[PDB]
């Protein structure tokens, strides 16, 4: 691990549009929460019954 590697990685994230600044394992959940369709919104769920 170097400073070069970290600068590179930061650039990679910023470019591909993934998380820029370093985050906790615990906080990344937030991203997950907005990346997805919340469970109660899926057609498999609210539309379940005829």
């Amino acid at each position: 691990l170097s400073e070069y590697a970290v600068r590179m990685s930061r650039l990679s994230a910023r470019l591909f549009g993934e998380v820029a600044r370093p985050t906790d394992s615990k906080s990344m959940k937030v991203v997950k929460l907005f990346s997805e369709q919340p469970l109660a919104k899926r057609k498999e769920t609210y539309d379940w019954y005829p």
Binding site: E3, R7, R10, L11, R14, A20
Partner: peptide, 18 residues
């Protein structure tokens, strides 16, 4: 620690990205 400046706007307007 180090916070480096990446220009979203420059590459944006240039590549039709904004």
């Amino acid at each position: 620690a180090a916070a480096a400046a990446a220009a979203a706007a420059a590459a944006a307007a240039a590549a039709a990205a904004a």
